[PDB]
C-alpha cells in the first residue's frame, strides 16, 4: 500500500518513533518519502545480490533473512517478507535496532542526501499530532 | 535519564484471578516500554515488547497497554508459576532504565510447617564446632517465629535464620534456623529444642533431642 | 537455538578490573547487538552497555567511563571489563542480546579483599517421609551449588539462601524422601564451590551410637 504523509506520520507516532535515538517524527516521515515514496511493497535489487524491502528500504545483507543474499546476517531476527506488510510494526521494530547503531539514521542514504539538514518538521505540518 | 515508577510494590492473588501492574515514565516514552518476569536472580524473561506486542511462547493471559507516560501489564487467570518480580524497561532513551519492580505472591491455603531438628555431625564436633539445625518446611503464610531452648532456657545468641522465596510447585515458604556454639558450650548442656509458632498452630510445634542418645 | 553463558572470576579486589566473558552458541557474534545487565542485591536492575554491528558501544553514564565492551568474532564471544571496582559493583552480571530474547544464567561477582575460603560440608542425619540435610559452613565467596544424588533427586529439596557472619557464608540444604527409600537407598549431597575449585560429596548415613 502507499501511505499518505499524515497517515504515515500518525502511525510512526503510535509506533513510538518520535525522538527515538533523538530523531524527530519529521525525520522518519522524510526518510520513508525519499527511501520508498511511502510504498510498503517497494523493493530494490543491489549489485551485491542483496535487496532493500518496504517503507524504509531495509537491506537483506544485514537486517533480514530473504534466502538469496550473500554474507547475510539477519540482525532484526525476521524474514524480509515481514518488511513488505501494510502493517508497519516489523519495519518500525527493525528501524529502531538499525538507528540504535552508532551510525544512527545515516543507515538511510536517501535520508542523508534529501532529509539531513532540511526543515523535516514540514513533513508533519497539518497532521495535528 | 528516564525514571520508571512501578505500583504497587506487592500483589498477592489467588490462582484463576486477575491483576493489573502499573508503570509510569518520568517523561513520554511513546510505545518504547518492555515488560520482564524474574524469579529472584534467575534470568529475566521478556513478556511484552513495545508496550503491547506479543512474544511467541508467552501466554495470551499476559496483555500490555498504554502509551506516553502511563503503562499497564494485565495478567488474567494467574497460575502458580507467575510468582516473582515484574519489571518494566524503557528503550526510548539511552541509558535504558528499569522500574523498581512489582512483587507477585500466590495466595494458597494456610499450611503448618514440617519441623525437623538435627544434632551436630561427628565431623563438625571433631573440628571443635557444634551447629544445631532446624528446618521449617512448606508453610503458608510467610510470617513465622522460631525459639531455641537449651534445658528449658531460651537463646538469642548464635542463631542465624534463612527463608526461601515462594515454592514454584506448591506456593509455600520454607525456613532454616542454625544455632552455632563451640564443642565446649555444646557439651555443657543435654536438651536442645526448636519451637515454631505460626498462624496455623494450636500450640508451638516442638522438636528436640538429648546429646546422651542416638 | 541461541544460548548465552557468562564465565570469569566471582571475586575481584577493590580498585581492580572485573573481567567477564559471554559465550554465544547457535549463531554468530555478527548476528546481533550484545548487552551486559547487572542486578544489585536489592532487586535493582542496571543496563550497563551494548555493542552494535559496526563496533559502536553505548555505556551507561552512571559507570563514569569505567566500562569496556569488546568482541572476538573467531571465539564467538564478547567481553565486559569494568575498571576501579568498589563494593558498590558487587552484583549479578547478565549477558543478553539487545532484543532481550536471549539471556545468560547470570554470574555473581563479589568485590572484596577477603581471601577465598572453601566450605566445610556436614551431613544432617535424623536422631512416611524422612527429612535429611547438608550443612555448608565457612566459605567465601558465594556461590555454592548443592545437588542431591547428582541432580536425580530434585523434588523435596530446599537449598536456603546463604547467610554471611564475619566474612564467611553458611548455607543449609534439606531433602524429604519416602521412609522406604532411606537409609535402604543412598542419599548424597554434592557441593560445588567454583572459586576454590572444590567438589565434595557427603553421604547421609544413620548416626553411630
Residue numbers in the entry:
A (entry chain C): 1 to 129
B (entry chain L): 1 to 214
C (entry chain H): 1 to 127, 134 to 215
Task: Reproduce passages from the article.
Here we address this question from biophysical, structural, and immunological perspectives using structurally related lysozyme proteins. To understand the conformational basis for selection or counterselection of cross-reactivity against foreign and self-antigens during antibody hypermutation in germinal centers, we used a mouse model where the cross-reacting foreign and self-antigens are well-defined lysozyme proteins. To investigate the impact of conformational flexibility of foreign antigen on antibodies that cross-react with self, we analyzed mice to track and sequence HyHEL10 (Hy10)-derived antibodies on single B cells responding to four structurally similar lysozyme proteins.
By contrast, RigidR101D lysozyme was identical to self-lysozyme except for one arginine-to-aspartate charge reversal at residue 101, at the contact surface with Hy10 antibody. When structurally aligned, the overall FlexR101D and RigidR101D complexes superpose tightly (antigen-Fv components with rmsd of 0.49 Å over 258 Cα positions), with localized differences observed in the antibody–antigen interfaces. When comparing the Hy104X-FlexR101D and Hy10-RigidR101D complex structures, the surface buried in the two complexes is comparable; in FlexR101D, antibody VH and VL domains bury 544 A2 and 362 A2 of antigen surface (total of 906 Å2), while in the rigid complex, the VH and VL domains bury 566 A2 and 325 A2 (total of 891 Å2).
